[PDB]
């Protein structure tokens, strides 16, 4: 079983290709300044994730860039401090200063060589331009959550990408899934029984930081600990 056997990957980006745990982190710091009990990196994250899933369940079709306005409302509400609607709409066009991982421009230029590259993604057009920007590469596709209506985990986003990837002389036996996030990822992934590669982001840290916690853990055909090491991996198949 081998990462030469697909014609494509299919990208997830905030998480997996875009580190977005930093980036919302930073985007956040004003707010979680003022809550002063000096809540861990972590517990912020995890409060992200249960706002943000929960606002994206609710509201499918609300561009990213609207959403998280609200899951800033919403942490301000549930921590006790005040805010303003200027910060949530703020909040929500910091994405677009979320930063790459430092390999992943690299990486993905090195991918781009053997694969089609496609992004399924939790993300407006808009504001996936900037991130597109970072990130150095041209995709072959960009499904984003806009343009299915719903946000991943839901199954449109798979058959939207399913539904399109003809367009591009694919079947989805050709394309590995790679991603970091187990719940909004890996778990559909396998239900429509696409080959996984999991980018483990967060191999040395504790929990999932901003993606929700997944009651059934998924299985993975391949895992690597950075797109350094996937690239490592597929160099040395080259090799033998
Ligand atoms: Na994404």
Same mark, same amino acid.
């Given at each position: ?51 943000? #899933? ?77 991130? %597109? ?22 199954? &449109? %986003? ?22 970091? #996030? ?18 483990? &982001? ?37 090799? %033998?």
């Amino acid at each position: 079983m081998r990462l030469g056997d697909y014609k494509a990957l299919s990208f997830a980006c905030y998480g997996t290709l875009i580190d977005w745990e930093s980036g919302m982190i930073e985007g956040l710091r004003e707010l979680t300044a003022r809550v002063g009990t000096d809540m861990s990196r972590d517990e912020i994250l995890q409060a992200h994730a249960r706002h943000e #899933s929960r606002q994206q369940a609710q509201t499918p079709g609300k561009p990213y860039r609207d959403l998280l306005p609200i899951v800033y409302k919403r942490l301000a509400e549930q921590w006790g401090v005040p805010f303003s609607q200027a910060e949530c709409e703020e909040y929500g066009r910091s994405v677009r200063n979320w930063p790459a991982f430092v390999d992943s421009p690299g990486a993905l230029q090195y991918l781009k060589k053997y694969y089609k590259l496609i992004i399924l993604s939790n993300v407006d057009n808009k504001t996936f331009q900037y991130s %597109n920007e970072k990130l150095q590469v041209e995709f072959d596709a960009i499904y984003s959550a806009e343009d299915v209506g719903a946000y991943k985990p839901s199954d &449109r %986003n798979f058959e939207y990408m399913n539904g399109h990837i003809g367009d591009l002389g694919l079947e989805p036996g050709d394309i590995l899934h790679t991603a970091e #996030s187990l719940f909004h990822d890996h778990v559909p992934a396998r239900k429509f029984g696409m080959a996984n590669c999991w980018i483990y &982001r967060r191999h040395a840290q504790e929990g999932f930081g901003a993606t929700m916690t997944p009651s059934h853990e998924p299985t993975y055909d391949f895992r690597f600990n950075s797109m350094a090491d996937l690239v490592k991996a597929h160099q040395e198949e080259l090799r %033998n």
